[PDB]
């Protein structure tokens, strides 16, 4: 691995990479951060504590022009795996947590491509606030949300957007939580009806506020009432 | 951000984040303290503790972190990791679980005049003595006592945040309303020491009324 | 023990843990993975989580961490902190609510030939579809999917150490009997 040792030394030592500084030519510019969310599994929804526990893989994508190289000058290397603490990160956190765990669980390596694109897919176990509507329990449906923003950066420094996918050479936004049809195991009590994703911008807040922008991934989940039916309702009603 | 890099290099040359900013001996650092309540998580009567999610709002001046924007490409403000600058050791004194500090240090916003605004998040479990006499048709008076753990009033002076509203801020749209508790009052007060080692406090009070529908239906 | 000190100083003078440990970047790092199941801690049917105690044996050759024992007083093997070297980033893909990767960074046994053996412990909380149809006479089939999170097969290759998991040091369970076990 001579060649990527040369490339890492070229990027970080020769060009003097500074991860404290954002990847921008001027301060007034904003860094575009594209976010997607994959739901590995819905762990639980505790009604008494009103807490949604989820396992999510967060796909971050941005551009760092300082981390560009010509592939044929470096042995046709097209991608690098780097520890996330060498490079600048757009520190996204779960704003609406209810346990103090704002950050991702496992800080995996970033993937850096020769054309300057930084890809990062940290997984996380999140415990979020989900107020519970008990009106139709056990025939109820709940509307939980995972709100993602940056407390270290505002809309003046990073611009949050949704991931973009392609089909028939046509680009579209990914406006939903990604679920693998084969690898996903459904929760034993909750069935996902809707799973949208939205970029919410508050026009009232100033542009230098962390509360201006966020990306929210919603889970509309219907309870499967067979357990409660069989074990409570039929005995109680009879 | 080469200009920002030079500005940070200038600001942090010879800077010691463990040293309180005082241009002269005897100068007091005025720290304005305010609170935003993101969520009243719970009030556990068995443990006698109020669980809340908040954003602190700490404002103070550090003369060492001042610069002329004209000499630095018109940069009027910076966002800096909180561990890099001096912080006042403002903690929740009446925590119940032994956790004094904030949940995430995040970043301070430093203006060119030396003003520093820090808004860390915090998940706090504070002690609250439950008045059990009228439970579940009761109201409780749960306080969050914030103060410097080490510095005395001759070194760090506290004041209630405003700019004058002496209250806990609750954002109307984004507040997670508790299903069992209604916030009646939410003032904030500056408590002076009795009559160094003396220390002021900023106490944020939450007077909260229980909503007893569950106990009416079930008991 | 001065020979070992000199060797350890020599090895990590021009070492990088970011860089993959083979001679050419077009080569693939060959990692042998084995799983030892020490204890089946618990099966949670509600949240569908199997929690187990495991040792995740990982073996691979580091091209740059080689030496001649004759040059170092006959030292043929040493123990090195795992944080100091490149490692494969094995992740439990079907983790339910536990740790995704190894968090207990124990020491690695390094031979003079560059072969590294690293056997960290872990508590795996894995998501297992629980079929309650025949409960309490139910048979379950719970899996542990392991893979390099950020490295694909063209840069890092993982192979099983054995066809079956290592159950030699398995504690008896008061609730379950492992009839069959197999790694693919």
């Amino acid at each position, epitope marked *: 691995l001579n060649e990527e040792e040369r490339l890492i*030394r*070229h990027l970080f030592q020769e060009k003097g990479y500074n991860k404290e500084l954002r990847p921008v030519a001027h301060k007034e510019e904003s860094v575009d951060v594209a976010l997607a969310l994959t739901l590995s599994n819905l762990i639980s929804l505790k009604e008494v504590e009103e807490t949604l526990t989820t396992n999510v893989w967060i796909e971050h994508g941005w551009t760092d022009n300082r981390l560009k190289w010509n592939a044929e000058e470096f042995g046709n290397i097209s991608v690098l795996r780097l520890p996330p603490d060498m490079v600048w990160l757009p520190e996204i956190v779960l704003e609406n947590n209810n346990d103090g765990s704002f950050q991702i669980s496992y800080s995996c390596n970033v993937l850096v491509y020769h054309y300057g694109f930084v890809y990062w897919l940290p997984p996380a176990i999140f415990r979020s606030s989900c107020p519970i509507s008990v009106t139709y329990f056990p025939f109820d449906w709940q509307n939980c949300s995972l709100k993602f923003s940056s407390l270290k950066y505002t809309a003046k420094e990073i611009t949050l957007s949704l991931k973009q996918d392609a089909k028939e050479n046509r680009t579209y936004p990914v406006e939903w939580i990604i679920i693998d049809p084969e690898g996903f195991t459904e929760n034993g009590e909750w069935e996902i009806v809707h799973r949208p994703a939205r970029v919410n911008v508050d026009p009232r807040a100033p542009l230098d506020s962390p509360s201006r922008q966020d990306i929210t991934f919603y889970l509309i989940i219907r309870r499967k009432p067979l357990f409660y039916i069989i074990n409570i309702l039929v005995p109680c009603v009879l | 951000s080469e200009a920002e890099g030079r500005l940070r290099e200038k600001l942090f040359s010879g800077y010691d984040s463990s040293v309180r900013p005082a241009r002269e001996v005897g100068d007091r650092v005025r720290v304005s303290v305010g609170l935003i309540l993101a969520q009243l998580i719970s009030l556990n009567e068995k443990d006698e503790e109020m669980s809340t999610k908040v954003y602190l709002d700490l404002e103070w001046t550090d003369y060492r972190l001042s610069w002329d924007p004209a000499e630095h490409d018109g940069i009027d403000s910076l966002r800096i990791t909180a561990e890099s600058v001096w912080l006042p050791d403002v903690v929740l004194l009446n925590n119940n679980d032994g956790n004094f500090d904030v949940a995430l240090d995040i970043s301070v916003v430093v203006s060119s005049d030396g003003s520093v605004r820090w808004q860390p998040p915090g998940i706090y479990r504070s002690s609250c003595s439950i008045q059990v006499t009228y439970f579940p048709f009761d109201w409780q008076n749960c306080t969050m006592v914030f103060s410097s753990y080490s510095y005395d009033s001759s070194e760090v002076s506290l004041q209630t945040g405003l700019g004058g509203h002496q209250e806990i801020h609750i954002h109307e749209g984004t507040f997670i309303e508790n299903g069992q508790w209604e916030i009646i009052h939410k003032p904030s007060r500056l408590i002076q020491p009795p009559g160094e080692g003396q220390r002021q406090e900023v106490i944020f009070y939450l007077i909260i009324r229980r909503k007893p529908l569950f106990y009416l239906v079930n008991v | 023990s001065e020979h070992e000190t000199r060797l350890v100083a020599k090895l990590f003078k021009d070492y990088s843990s970011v860089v993959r440990p083979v001679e050419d970047h077009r080569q693939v790092v060959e990692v042998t993975v084995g799983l030892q199941l020490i204890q089946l801690i618990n099966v949670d049917e509600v949240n569908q989580i199997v929690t187990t105690n495991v040792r995740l044996k990982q073996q691979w050759v580091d091209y740059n961490l080689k030496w001649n024992p004759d040059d170092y007083g006959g030292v043929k093997k040493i123990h090195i902190p795992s944080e100091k070297i490149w490692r494969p980033d094995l992740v439990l893909y079907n983790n339910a609510d536990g740790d995704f990767a190894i968090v207990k960074f124990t020491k690695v046994l390094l031979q003079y030939t560059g072969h590294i053996t690293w056997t960290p412990p872990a508590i795996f909380k894995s998501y297992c579809e629980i079929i309650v149809t025949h409960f309490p006479f139910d048979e379950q089939n719970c899996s542990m999917k392991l893979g390099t999170w950020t490295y694909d097969g063209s840069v890092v290759a993982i192979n099983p150490e054995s066809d079956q998991p290592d159950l030699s040091n398995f504690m008896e369970s008061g609730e379950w009997v492992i009839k069959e076990s197999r790694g693919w």
Partner: antibody, heavy 129, light 105 residues
Framework: EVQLVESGGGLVKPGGSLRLSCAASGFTFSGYWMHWVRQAPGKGLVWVSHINGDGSSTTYADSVKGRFTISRDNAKNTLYLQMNALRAEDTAVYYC??????????????????????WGQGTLVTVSS | QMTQSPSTLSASVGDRVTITCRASQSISSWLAWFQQKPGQAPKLLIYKASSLESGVPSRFSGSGSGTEFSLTISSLQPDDFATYYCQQYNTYWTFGQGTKVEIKR
């Protein structure tokens, strides 16, 4: 573009003193070790001295161990070399150069290499009586 | 200590050149190769004994480890006639006595 410009040379009598200066531009001056390297007329390159990024650590050649003093000012982006007890054997073109391999060594992922990549045009010092 | 060879080397355009360097003690890979044309400053060609600089032509190559190292020019060009130096680092920096490449006639 990375640039190093030297100055402060000329004719000095033996036993005197001189101050060589090197102005840097195009990179973070404080983040790199810096070296002074002399080339006598019609001879090869000879390393004079080395200074850390902050300036805590300094190193000198055996022939200039007690007579030279390397220093730096990161605010002005200026490397300096004070020379004392000059002799006729110190007549040379002096070069200031940046050690690229010393950047980011506080991180555990980067180790040092000798990578004197950018060199200034140099400045001539003539020690003669 | 450093020993370069040959002190002088005559060749023409298109010929292969190999300049050898020898250390009295094992310096592992801490070696750089520099080029210096007359009247100019040194230019680093290789660092760590095999790593080409970003802007250097690919004809230049570097090999060697421990004590024996070498610089190879596959095809000489008019701009490659210069004095080639080597430098090592064990605990201080030591340059080796240079070697000059001249046009052969």
């Amino acid at each position: 573009e990375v640039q190093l410009v030297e100055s402060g040379g000329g004719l000095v009598k033996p036993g005197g003193s001189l101050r060589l200066s090197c102005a840097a531009s195009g990179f973070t001056f404080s983040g790199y070790w810096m070296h002074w390297v002399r080339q006598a007329p019609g001879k090869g390159l000879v390393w004079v001295s080395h200074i850390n990024g902050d300036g805590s650590s300094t190193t000198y050649a055996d022939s200039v161990k007690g007579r030279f003093t390397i220093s730096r000012d990161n605010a002005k982006n200026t490397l300096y070399l004070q020379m004392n007890a000059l002799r006729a054997e110190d007549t040379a073109v002096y070069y200031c150069t940046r050690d690229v391999g010393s950047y980011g060594l506080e991180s555990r992922y980067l180790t040092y290499v000798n990578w004197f990549d950018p060199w200034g045009q140099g400045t001539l010092v003539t020690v003669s009586s | 200590q450093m020993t370069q060879s040959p002190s002088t080397l005559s060749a023409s355009v298109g010929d292969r050149v190999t300049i050898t360097c020898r250390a009295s003690q094992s310096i592992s890979s801490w070696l750089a190769w520099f080029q210096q044309k007359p009247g100019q400053a040194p230019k680093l060609l290789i660092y760590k004994a095999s790593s080409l600089e970003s802007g250097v032509p690919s004809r230049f190559s570097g090999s060697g480890s421990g004590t024996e190292f070498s610089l190879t020019i596959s095809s000489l060009q008019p701009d490659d006639f210069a004095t080639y130096y080597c430098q090592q680092y064990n605990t201080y920096w030591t340059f080796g006595q240079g070697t000059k490449v001249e046009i052969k006639r």
